Amino acid sequence: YRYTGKLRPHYPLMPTRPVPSYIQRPDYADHPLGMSESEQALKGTSQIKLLSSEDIEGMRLVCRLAREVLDVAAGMIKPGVTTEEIDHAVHLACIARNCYPSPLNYYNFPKSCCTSVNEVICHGIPDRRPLQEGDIVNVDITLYRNGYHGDLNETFFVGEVDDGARKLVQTTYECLMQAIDAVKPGVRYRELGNIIQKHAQANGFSVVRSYCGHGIHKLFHTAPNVPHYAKNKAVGVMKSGHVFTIEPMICEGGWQDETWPDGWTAVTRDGKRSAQFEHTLLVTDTGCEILTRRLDSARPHFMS
Numbered sequence: 620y621r622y623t624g625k626l627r628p629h630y631p632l633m634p635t636r637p638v639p640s641y642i643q644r645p646d647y648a649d650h651p652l653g654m655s656e657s658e659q660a661l662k663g664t665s666q667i668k669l670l671s672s673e674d675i676e677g678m679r680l681v682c683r684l685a686r687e688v689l690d691v692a693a694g695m696i697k698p699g700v701t702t703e704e705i706d707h708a709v710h711l712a713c714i715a716r717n718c719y720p721s722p723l724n725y726y727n728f729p730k731s732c733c734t735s736v737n738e739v740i741c742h743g744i745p746d747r748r749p750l751q752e753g754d755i756v757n758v759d760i761t762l763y764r765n766g767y768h769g770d771l772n773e774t775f776f777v778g779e780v781d782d783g784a785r786k787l788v789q790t791t792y793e794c795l796m797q798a799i800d801a802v803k804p805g806v807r808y809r810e811l812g813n814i815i816q817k818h819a820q821a822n823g824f825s826v827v828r829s830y831c832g833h834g835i836h837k838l839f840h841t842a843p844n845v846p847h848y849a850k851n852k853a854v855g856v857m858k859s860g861h862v863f864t865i866e867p868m869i870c871e872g873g874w875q876d877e878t879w880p881d882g883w884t885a886v887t888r889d890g891k892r893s894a895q896f897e898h899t900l901l902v903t904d905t906g907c908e909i910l911t912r913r914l915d916s917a918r919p920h921f922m923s
């Protein structure tokens with residue numbers, strides 16, 4: 620395997636983390652290949668669940684907890700901490716909130732969150748590499764509670780970073796907020812990619828194409844599929860009661876991605892940097908509710 624940039628995996632990984640048996644688990648938690656029977660029963664289906672008031676309350680709760688655990692991770696982004704240490708803290712924060720960390724064993728993913736440094740587009744595996752000043756890192760969290768999943772992620776600066784890092788991270792966030800801004804009953808899901816790419820292109824950046832936002836609720840990843848690039852053919856129209864994520868992955872160089880030999884890590888084929896932000900949203904009659912919004916500040920961590 621020819622790596623595309625300077626990053627390399629740092630093994631071995633510490634032994635897998637158990638979840639106290641008292642934490643409720645999703646069906647794939649104990650599946651040997653980590654498959655989700657319930658998600659497979661709806662594979663290829665375009666229909667989009669309309670949540671009930673019990674559901675909405677369930678989504679509100681797990682999404683607030685998820686935000687709390689992301690804020691914990693944020694607190695740890697300093698040079699020299701390893702992504703596995705971050706993951707460890709995150710694992711413990713889900714347990715303490717009586718939640719299961721959704722990524723854990725999902726299709727056999729070995730950790731409790733995804734940490735994606737620099738050229739890693741998404742799904743980086745927490746490992747022994749200490750964060751380096753100048754690095755940018757995304758931590759993507761998903762929690763499961765009472766039958767519901769809550770998902771968000773933010774890109775962070777490690778120490779001081781260069782101007783390009785700053786511009787990439789800022790633009791990406793803007794891409795995300797301009798798409799949220801358009802969410803309301805009646806809008807087609809395929810429209811968001813137009814907004815996202817329009818802003819990324821205007822700033823010299825490209826939009827990853829192999830990964831998309833997704834519906835989320837009782838299932839981790841379900842309809843709708845939400846591409847973040849222009850002129851896509853996403854299926855569906857937003858309706859009050861729909862819950863889904865927007866999570867654009869934007870790159871300094873080209874949009875092409877490839878996967879490391881570990882079967883998970885998605886990286887830019889050109890080795891340039893990538894950044895991402897994500898919120899889980901609920902369409903309401905006036906627009907949408909940002910379920911994973913930071914509550915103690917108006918801004919994401921990087922700009923502060």
Ligand SMILES: Cc1nc(-c2ccccn2)nc(NCCc2ccccc2)c1Cl
Pocket residue numbers: 722725726728733742830831833840
């Ligand atoms: C966003 C997204 N993410 C994940 C994932 C899995 C483990 C940890 C973090 N993300 N799986 C998805 N569906 C399962 C099939 C799959 C696995 C790997 C890469 C792409 C799809 C989707 Cl849609």
Ligand SMILES: [Co+2]
Pocket residue numbers: 741742
């Ligand atoms: Co994912």
Ligand SMILES: [Co+2]
Pocket residue numbers: 770771832833864866897
């Ligand atoms: Co997501």
Ligand SMILES: [Co+2]
Pocket residue numbers: 759760761770771772866897
């Ligand atoms: Co996510």
Ligand SMILES: [K+]
Pocket residue numbers: 735736737738739740755756757892893894895
């Ligand atoms: K990255």
